[PDB]
C-alpha cells in the first residue's frame, strides 16, 4: 500500500544513452545493490537523464515474509476402478488347455479377447482354471480354463500431485513496477534469480532459514487446495499405502495409461466357476485430502498455501533485514514527452522512528496529469517518491527518522519547479 | 486347432433381397466358390471374433433361419434424395469398407437387418457411408459390425440399455443431457436378444457350454483325405439310421457308435456349444453379440 | 503371506433401495465400488503395528496358521518355503515355472 | 495428414519477373507440372518450415495477390557496373543455391520483393553470389529464405526490431557500438507486417485460429479416384450455388449439406486459418514469417 | 524432436520439448471438440560473459 | 565447497560437495569447460525437469528457480576466517592458500 522507502541513485558508469530528434534515450547495463524494504514498503530506483523532469522510477514492492518449501520428487495419483471380463472355455478348445494357463503372462494378448484391440491403457490377462466334466460344460474330464481380461479405468475428473520437501527456503513476493508502468509479480528465494524484460533480480542477503520436513508428504490439488500427510515420501509403490499408482501428468491419471507405474498383484480376483468377483483395495486420496487440509499448525510452525499462485507457504516469526541486487542487461529507456506541474499538501504523519517499520506519512497531491512527484530536503538525506495522477489524490509512504519530534522543510517538484513543504508530527519509540 | 472355418452349419446362405447376383456361389456356402460376403470374415487382422467363433451363425444366416427380421426397406438406396431411413444411424457409425463394393449390411436399432445399396454402376467410398464412381465390382455385401448370433428363442424385451454416465450413444436417447458432452467415435458392445431393441453393453461376460444339437458336430469321410458328410444320416440311441458314423465321447455320448462298422469320423465343433451372457446378474442366452464403432458421448461436466 | 500393517476393518452390509443386500468391508481410506456408486471410510480411530517378524499361512477350506518368523524372500533349503510356485495348479502338478532351492536333493 | 502440399489455395502463382518463362508449368500450380520454383520447397531436409505450413501462401503468391509490393528494381542485375541494388543484403545472407539456377529472390529491408536475375547464358554459383557460363538450365528461381505469408489487412507500422544483445543484424543498424563485436552466420527469424519494415525477433510464438473461410477447405470429387474440384461452386447458407458438396461439421457449418445427394466431399485443411504471432506483449496478424541465415553482430565485450 | 519445430534441426544445446494439452472447440481455434495439444520447445542459453569452476 | 573465479577471485561455501546435481541447489547444471557453460552445450549434465511451465491456451509462461552463483560469490569470498585458520587466495598463481602457524622443518 505505501510508496517507496529505500531510494538509491544510479551511477553514470552503468548508464549511457543519447538524443536523436529531441528524444532523450538512456541505457542501463550493470549491477546496483539496493536495500530491501519491510512488510509493505517499496524500493524504487531513480533514473535521471540530461534535464530534470526526465526521470523514471523502478519500484519493487515487498508483500511479506514467507517460508516456501523446496520441492524435489513428485508424482500424480488419484482414483481408479478395474474392469474384469470373464470367458470360461472347456479343455482342448483353441488355446484353453493345461499347458497355457499355468505359464500365462500378464502382457500376453489372449486369443479369445483378440477382438478387443490394442489399447494404451493398463490391462492384464489371466487364465483361472475351473472344474471340467459334464457338470459345468466340458466334454473332457480335464480342468477348464477361464480367460480374464481386466483393464483399469478412471472414474474421477481430477488428479492430485503428491510432492515432498527437504528444506525450507525463505521466499519473498515482490511486485515490481517498471519505468513505463508494466507491473509484474515475481518471488525470490535464498539465492534465486528471476529473468524480467528489463533484466533480472536476485536476493542478495537474507537472514531466515529453517529445516525440518523429511517426514512430511504434501498433496497438491489444483483448483481446490493442498493437503498435509504425516508420513515419509513414497518411493516404491505398493498395495495398501498412499501412492500405489503413480504417473507423470493429470491426463495420464484421468485416462489411466500404461506409461505410469503400478504394483504387481494389485487387482484381486474371486472366480466362482461362471462368476468373477475381482476387486481392488485402492486407497482413496480424497479421504485424506478431506481429513488433513491446510492450514495446519505442526509443532511450532503454521503451514498453508499461497495467495493466487500455486505453492506451499510456511508462516512464522522471521526477520526483516535483507539486501537485494539489480542486474541491467543493456535496457533502453525513452522519454518523448514531458511531465506537468502539480501541487502537494500535508495530511497526516503516523508511525515510529528508529525501527524497521518506519513512519507512515500521508500527503495530498493535486495535479492535472500523470506524473511523478518527488521531494527532497536540504542536506540531502531523505527523498520522497510519489506518483501523481489527474485531480486530487492522497499518497502516503514509509519514511525513516531518528528523532521523535519530526519537523523538516522539504522541496517537492514534478516537472522542474521546486516548492517548499514543511512537515511535522510526533512519532513513538519502536525498536 | 481344427481348420474348419468355411464349414457353416445349418443352411449356410449369404444373400439378401436386392443383391442376389452371387446366388450361384452363395446358396449354399461350401468349401469352393468366391463369396464376397464371407471372404473378408476370414482375413487375418479384420474380424478375429468370427475367427475364434467360426462354429456359429452370422446375421445373414440368422435371417435365413427365421431368427432376425428384415428392415423396411431391406436395401436402402443411396440414390434417392431428401434422405431415407438408413442415414441417421449410418452417418454416426464410423466404418471402413474396402474398394469395389456396392451393398453394406448392418444392425439397426429395431434389431432388424439393414443394408445400403448403390445403383449401377456405382461403388462405395473409403468408409461406405456415401457412393462414388470408379475394374469389376464385388456383387455382395460387407459386414460393417462385429456381431454374431445362434439358434435360440430366449425372450428379453424387459431389458434396455444401461451405460451409467453416458448421454447419447448411437441413435438411442438414454437421458436428456445439457452439460459438456464428450463426443468420440469408439467401439461399443451389444447383445440383441429376441423381439428387443439394440441393447448396448459395458462389460462382457460370455460362457461356453457343450451342446448336443446336430448343428454342433462334424463328420468327415476318408476317400482314396476328407469328405463332407451330412450328420443327419446318422443313427440315434435306440432308434435307426441309414448310414453309420463313429466319434469320441462327445459323439458317442449322444448318438450311437458302431466301431469298425462306421464309414465317417465325427467330432465336436472346435468353437461352438451354447454361449450365454451375463446381463444384470442373470445368465441369459443372447442372439447378437458384437462390437460396433459408433458415437460415444460421455458426460464430462 | 505376510503382513506389515494393520488396518481397522469395518465389515458393512449394504441394503439398497430395491432390496439388494451385499456384504463388503472398509478400512482407513479404502473405497469399495458398488452398483449405487462407491463407499469409503471418511474417518478412522485405530491402527497398530508390529508384525514384520511374523509369517502367516493361508489354507482355503481348512484354516490359517501363524508362524513366528520373518517372511521368506530367498528360496533356500532347510527353511519354510524351499520350493515355491505361483498358483495352486503349479503346486498340485509340480510346475517348472516355480522357484526352488539350488541343489536340495541329497544323492547317495 | 491431409496430403495437400501441392494444392495451393487462391491463385497459386509462383513466378517472378525476369524469368516468366515458366508460366505454362507454374501458373497455376497443380499436382502436375515441373516448376523449379516450387519443387525445392518440397524437398526433405531443405525448408521444413514450409513443409509444416504447406497450406498457406508463399511470398510470390502474396506478391501476385496484391499483398507484398515489389522493389525498384525488382530484378537485381548481376552484371551491372560497380555494385547493384541488392549486394550488401546478398553478401550477408549465407545460403546454398543449387546449380543450373539463374534468379534468386529474397526479402529486402523495406519489405518489398527482392530478386536477382542473370541474363543468358549465365548461371548461379554454389552460393548464388556470382555467376558463370554453361546442360539445360532451370526456368525459375530459388527461395533464399524460409518464410510464408497469408491474407491479412491489419496494420503494424509502429513496431520495429527489438533484439536483446544484438547491435547489427543482417543489414539493419540498430544501436551504436564500437567495441568487440562477434561476427558469425546464425539463423534469425523475421515477420514482415503491412506498410512497415523487416522486423526481426528472437522467439517465435505462432498460434492457429481456425474459422469459416473458403480458402481453408478442400473439396474433391470422384470421376472415372479423387479429383480436384473448385470450391467456389459450393452453395452458401440461403444464398446461391450450382453444384452440391458435403463434408464434416466445419465444412457444413458454412455451406449446405445434402447428405448423399451431394457429388463432392470436402474437409478442413491441415494447418490453416488465422495464425497469429506474439510480439510486443500482444497478438498480431503478420504478413510474412520465416527464418534466414544472416550475420549476427553481438557485443562480446 | 517434433516436426512442428523441424525448422530448428540439429543443435548442440540443452533443449527440451513438451506437449501441454489445452481446451478445444471453437473457443480456442479447432473444428473438433477434443482437447488440443501444445508443442513447447524450451532451450537454455547463457546471458553472462564468464563462468565459475566449483 | 570452493568456487574458483579466474580473473576475479575465489569463494568459500560451508557445505559438502554435491555429487548428484539436484534441482534448486547450488550447482544443478554442470559441464566440462568454460565454453560448455558460456554456450550451453548438450554434453553437460543437468537436473531433470527443473523448468516450471505455465500454459494459458494461447500464452505460455516458463520460470526457473536457478540459484545464481554470483550471489553466493558476492556473499562468501576469500579471505575468510573459519575455526582457527586464515583462508586466503593465491599470491601469483592459482589455488586456495590456507594460512596457519608453525616454523620450518623441511629438507630438499
Author numbering:
A (entry chain H): 688 to 1118
B (entry chain G), D (entry chain E): 154 to 287, 290 to 379, 393 to 469
C (entry chain J): 850 to 957
E (entry chain F): 796 to 849
F (entry chain F): 904 to 1011
What does the paper say about this structure?
Rift Valley fever virus (RVFV; genus phlebovirus, family Phenuiviridae) is an important example of an enveloped virus that harbours a class II fusion protein. As with other phleboviruses, RVFV displays two glycoproteins on the lipid bilayer envelope of the virion, Gn and Gc, which form higher order pentameric and hexameric ring-shaped assemblies. While the Gc glycoprotein is responsible for membrane fusion, the role of the Gn remains undefined. Virus entry is completed upon Gc-mediated fusion of the viral envelope and host cell membrane, in a pH-dependent mechanism.
Localized reconstruction of each of the four types of the Gn–Gc capsomers (pentamers and hexamers of type 1–3) resulted in four independent structures at resolutions between 7.7 and 8.6-Å. We first performed fitting with the localized reconstruction of the pentamer at 7.7 Å resolution, followed by fitting the resulting Gn–Gc heterodimer model to localized reconstructions of the hexamers at 8.0–8.6 Å resolution. Consistent with previous biochemical and structural studies, this fitting verified that the Gn and Gc assemble as heterodimers, which form higher order ring-like pentameric and hexameric capsomer structures on the mature virion. Domain A of the Gn forms a ring on top of these capsomers interacting with domain II of Gc, occluding a surface area of ~950 Å2. The Gn–Gc interface is formed between the β-ribbon domain of the Gn and the hydrophobic fusion loops of Gc11, which are shielded from solvent at the interface between Gn domains A and B. Surprisingly, unlike the rod-like array of extended anti-parallel Gc dimers predicted from the low-resolution modelling attempts, we observed that RVFV Gc forms a kinked conformation, not previously sampled in crystallographic investigations of class II fusion glycoproteins. Sub-tomogram averaging and MDFF fitting revealed that while non-membrane-facing capsomers retain the pre-fusion configuration, membrane-interacting pentamers undergo pronounced conformational rearrangements that allow the insertion of the Gc-residue hydrophobic fusion loops into the target membrane. This insertion event is achieved, in part, by a dramatic translational shift of the Gn, which unshields the Gc allowing it to form an extended intermediate state. Although it is tempting to speculate that the pentamers might have a lower activation barried to escape their metastable state than the hexamers, possibly due to less favourable subunit–subunit angles (72° in the 60 heterodimers making the pentamers as opposed to ~60° in the 660 heterodimers making the hexamers), this hypothesis remains to be tested.
